Amino acid sequence: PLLRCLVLTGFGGYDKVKLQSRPAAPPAPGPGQLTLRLRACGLNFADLMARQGLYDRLPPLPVTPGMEGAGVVIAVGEGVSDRKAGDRVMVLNRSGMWQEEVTVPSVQTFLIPEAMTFEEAAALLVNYITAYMVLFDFGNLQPGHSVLVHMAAGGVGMAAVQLCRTVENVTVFGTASASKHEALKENGVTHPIDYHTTDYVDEIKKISPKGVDIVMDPLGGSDTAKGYNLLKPMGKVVTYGMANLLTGPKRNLMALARTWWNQFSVTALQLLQANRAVCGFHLGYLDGEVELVSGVVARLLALYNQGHIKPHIDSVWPFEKVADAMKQMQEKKNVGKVLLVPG
C-alpha cells in the first residue's frame, strides 16, 4: 500500500518535479491536527514560481509543493472538536499539498459542502479567497463600478469575474488571449481584450476614457504603473502578483532584472494629489490570521450554496503528468483551474 508524492528537488524546468513513493505509515495526528488523504490538488501560478525559485515562501529544498487540496480526514488529533474521521475538507497550507497523504492544522481546513465535488473544492480556496479580498476588502467593489481583471481566463481571473457578477451593474474589462474571449463573455467579462496583440490601456480608454474603478494587478513591474494610471477618482489598484517574471520553463534573468529596475513606488504627495489607492495582497502572508481568512471562506461557501459562484475546472492531471499540467498553465492554454490527482 504505497503513497504517491511529488517533490521539487531543484529549481528549473518541468523535469525538476519528480514522482516518488513512500510506505503508508499509520496516521498519527498531533494535538489540534488532522491527517487526511488528498483526492485533488490545485496548480497555482505560485507553484510555477516556486519551481523556478521565485516564490520566497517556499521551504528549503527538497520539498513537496502545492498550497491547496481537498480530501478526506483519516485521523483526527486531540483538541479538534468539529472534525471526525471521514469528513471531507479543503485544506490551505504553505506547502506539501502535492502528495497523497498530508497532516495539517485542523484550523486550516474547511468542511466541503454537500453537492461540491473534490475538484470544485480544490479549485475554490486560493483563487476565490484572493479574488474576494482583492475586490472587496481592498477594492470595495460597489454597484456601478468598473473593474479591470487581468488574466481573466485564469483561476483568480474567473473567480473575480464571477464575484463581480455578484455585485449589481459592474462593468468588467477582462484581458486574455483572443481564443479565450468567448469563454470570457460566458463568465461575465463585459469587454474582452487581448493584451498579447494590443495595448489594453488604449482599448480600455477607447471604451471608458476616464478609466476604471478597480484594477487587479497580477502582472507587476511596469504594468503596475499602467494600472495606477487607469484609475478613476477614488480608484484602487490592488497589486498581488509578478506574473511578468514567468516567460518559460527556466528562470530568465532578463525579466528578473527588468522588473527589478522597473519597480513601482509611490509617494504620499503622489497619492494625495490624485484620488487613488495602491494596495498589496499576499495570501501566503496571511497565515496566522485564521479568523480573517475563515470569515472569507464562510462568505465564499455562502455564495457557492446560493449558486453565485462555481469554480471552472480547465483540466485534471495525474501526478505522473505533473509536467504537462504545469505546461498547461505556463503555455497559456488553460481557461480556469488546473488540478492534479494522485494517479
Place this chain on the structure above:
Amino acid sequence: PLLRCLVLTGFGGYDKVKLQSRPAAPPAPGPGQLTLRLRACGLNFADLMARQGLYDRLPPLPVTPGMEGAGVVIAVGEGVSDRKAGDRVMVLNRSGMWQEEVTVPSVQTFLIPEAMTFEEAAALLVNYITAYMVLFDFGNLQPGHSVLVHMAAGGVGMAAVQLCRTVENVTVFGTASASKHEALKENGVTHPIDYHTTDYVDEIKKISPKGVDIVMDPLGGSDTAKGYNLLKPMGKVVTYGMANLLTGALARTWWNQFSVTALQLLQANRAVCGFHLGYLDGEVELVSGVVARLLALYNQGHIKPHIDSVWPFEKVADAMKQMQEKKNVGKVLLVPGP
C-alpha cells in the same frame, strides 16, 4: 446698503486677511449659476494653510478665502431647474466663501433640510464629506475594525468619530489635547491620546499590539510612515493633509517623506490612499451621492455637527487663532453680523 467680504492680501499671519465692503449691486447670475446670501461660513485648516502660502489650490492674490457656506438663494441663473429663490442651500467651492453675497455653479449647492440650522449646514460639508470618503470609500470601515482618528477634536475629527459610531463595534483611537479628551469620549472616542505629550504609536501599540485597521493621516510627513506601520493586515492609511507643514523647535524626522513600493505593500498586505477634496470638482455625481448619504445619516440623528464657536467677520483673526492655537473642539464658523 453695502455687502461685506474678507480678502487675503498677502501670505503670512492673521493680519493678512482684511475686511472690506462694496455696494450691493442687483444679483445677476450667469447660466447655470446661483447668487446667494451667506448666513454662516466655515473655517477650515486649508484656509490657515492658504493664508500662510501653503495651499496649492489657492487662486492668485488678492482673493476671498473660504470653501464652504450656508445661505439663501437670492437669484437663479438660466438653465437651473432644481433651485428657486429663497431656497436654503449649502455651497461648496474652491474659494470666495468669506463674504455676504456669492455666485457659484448651481451644481455645487445642496438643499439644506429643515430642522438643520444654517450653522450646522455650514459645518456639514467639508468635514463630513472628507470623513465619509476617508472612512468608507477608501477605508471601507466594517464592524469590528479599529480606526486611528488624528485630530479627533477638530472638524474632520469629530465628524469621523460620529461616522465611526454609525458602524457596529468600532474601536476609535483619537488624538487631541488632554483637555479635549473628555469631549472626545463624549463624541465616541474609545481611547483618547495626547500626541503633544506622548508617542501615539507607543500608546496605540500598548493598547492594541497588532495596530489598527484604518489610519486617518492629516499630519503627513514622517507621521505617514508611522501610520503605515500601525496597520493590521488588510489595513489602510488614508493621508489627506500636510498638517506637519504648519508647525508654527524643529526635529530631524520632520524632513521624512513617505515612499512605498509595490512589493512592500504586497508583502505587508496594506494599502496607502490619498484623498484631496479640492481635486474632486467636476465630479459632482460622486460628491453628491456622498452628500445624500450624509443628509440621510443626519435625518436619522446619527450625525450632528458640533459648533465650537461663531465669530463675526471683524473678529476673523480671533476665529483663526481659535484653530491655530489648538483651542477649538468642533467647527469654527464665521458670520457677517453687525
